[PDB]
Amino acid sequence: MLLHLIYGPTCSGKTDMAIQIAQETGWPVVALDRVQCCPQIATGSGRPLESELQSTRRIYLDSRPLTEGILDAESAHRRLIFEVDWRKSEEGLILEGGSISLLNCMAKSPFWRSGFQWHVKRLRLGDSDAFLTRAKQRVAEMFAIREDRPSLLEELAELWNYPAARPILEDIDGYRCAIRFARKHDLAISQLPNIDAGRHVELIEAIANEYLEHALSQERDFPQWP
Ligand SMILES: Nc1ncnc2c1ncn2[C@@H]1O[C@H](COP(=O)(O)O)[C@@H](O)[C@H]1O
Ligand SMILES: CC(C)=CCSP(=O)(O)OP(=O)(O)O
Ligand SMILES: [Zn+2]
Ligand SMILES: [Zn+2]
C-alpha cells in the first residue's frame, strides 16, 4: 500500500492538508501524535474539530485518560505498526503529525523500510514572524468559547482538579505556558477563563511564543526522512 507521510512543526497546516488528501482519496488519516491521544486535552493538543474533518476519518493511536500519562513513544510506535498492518489490503493511508519521538521511532524501525510506496511531505517554519502570526490565530481558536468543545482554558481548569493531572499538564505545551502564566500573575487556574481584556492578549502571545520554541526544537530533532 501507499503511505502518504506528512510531518513538520506545530501550526504548519499539516492537518488541513491531510483532511484535503483524505477527502480526495477516501483514505483515513492516522495521527502521528501522542499527546492527541488524550481527548480530555483535545483542543489544546490540536485535535481538529468534528466540523473540520468534513466526514473524513482521523485515527488516534490510543484513547486515554490524561492521568495515565501521555502515551510513551515506543507504545505509540507499536500501535502505529498495528493500525497500518491490519489495513494491509486497502490502497493507501495518510500518516500525519508532529511527534518528535514518534517520527524518530519510525525512522529507526525496520517496519517502514520495505513493502510500501511512500509520498513524503515535510513542512517547515520559515519566517519566525509569520510563524507567530499563524500561531496567535490558532491559539485564539483554541481559546474560543464554543457550543461543542471546551476551550484549552476550560480543559485546563477541568483537569486542575485532579492533583495527578497537574504534573502532566506542566509538561505539555500551551498548558505549561498557561500554568506558568497563572503563577506569574498570582491567578488561580480556575480564573484563567475570565482573564480580562488584554491579559488575554499577553497569554495568547506567550503560548504562541512557546509554540515557537517547540517548532524550533522540532526542526532540530526531527529525523531527516529518506
Ligand atoms: N499535540 C501536542 N500538543 C501539545 N504539546 C505537544 C504535542 N505534541 C508534543 N507536545 C510536546 O512535546 C513533548 C512530546 O514529545 P513528542 O511527542 O516527541 O513531540 C510533549 O511532552 C509536549 O510537551
Ligand atoms: C500545539 C502543539 C505544540 C502541537 C499541536 S499542533 P499540530 O502539529 O497539530 O498542527 P498542524 O496540523 O501542523 O496545524
Ligand atoms: Zn494537526
Ligand atoms: Zn515543546
Nearest to 37 by CA among 66, 14, 17: 66
Distance CA 42, CA 203 (A): 19
Where does residue 171 rank: exposed (0-12), middle (13-18), buried (19+ CB within 10 A)?
exposed
Cβ-based neighbours of 166, under 8 Å, separated by 6 or more: 160
Experimental technique, in short, is X-ray
Per-residue exposure over 101-114, b if at least 16 CB sit within 10 Å of its own CB, e if not: ebbebbeeeeebee
The per-residue DSSP string of 22-62 comes to HHHH---EEE--SGGG-GGGTTTTTPPPHHHHTT--EE-S-
User: Which residues line the pocket of ligand 1, CB cutoff 6 A?
Assistant: 33-36, 45-46, 99-102, 171-174
CA 110 to centroid of ligand 2, rounded, Å: 27
CA 36 to centroid of ligand 1, rounded, Å: 9
Given resolution (angstroms)? 2.1
- The CA–CA distances, whole Å, from 33 to 29, 95, 100, 127 equal 12, 10, 9, 24
Instruction: Answer yes or no: is the C-beta of 174 below 6 A from any ligand 2 atom.
Output: yes
Instruction: Answer yes or no: is the C-beta of 92 below 6 A from any ligand 2 atom.
Output: no
The edge-to-edge listing of strands for the beta sheet with 29-31 is 58-59, 29-31, 92-97, 2-7, 117-122
The CATH number assigned to the domain with range 1-124 reads 3.40.50.300
Q: What is the 3-state secondary structure (H, E, C) of 200-224?
A: HHHHHHHHHHHHHHHHHHHHHHCCC
Cα 8 to chain center, whole Å?
Answer: 11
Per-residue exposure over 188-205, b if at least 16 CB sit within 10 Å of its own CB, e if not: ebeebbebeeeebeebbe
Residues carrying CATH 1.10.287.890, the chain: 125-226
Length of the chain, please? 226
For the domain with range 125-226, which CATH number is right: 1.10.287.890, 1.20.140.10, 2.40.40.20, 3.90.480.20?
1.10.287.890
CA 195 to centroid of ligand 3, rounded, Å: 27
Distance CA 172, CA 210 (A): 10
Distance CA 197, CA 12 (A): 28
| Cell digits of residue 213 | 520554541
- The CA–CA distances, whole Å, from 114 to 212, 222, 224 equal 35, 21, 17
Residues carrying CATH 3.40.50.300, the chain: 1-124
DSSP state of 71: P
In one-letter notation, the amino acid at residue 153 is L
At 106 the three-state DSSP class reads helix
Residue nearest to atom 21 of ligand 1 (CA): 172
Q: What is the 3-state secondary structure (H, E, C) of 115-174?
A: CCEEEEEECCCCCHHHHHHHHHHHHHHHHCCCCCCCCHHHHHHHHCCCHHHHHHHCCCCC
Given the CA of residue 98, which atom of ligand 2 is nearest to it?
A: 8
* Helical ranges in 166-198 per DSSP H: 166-169, 175-184
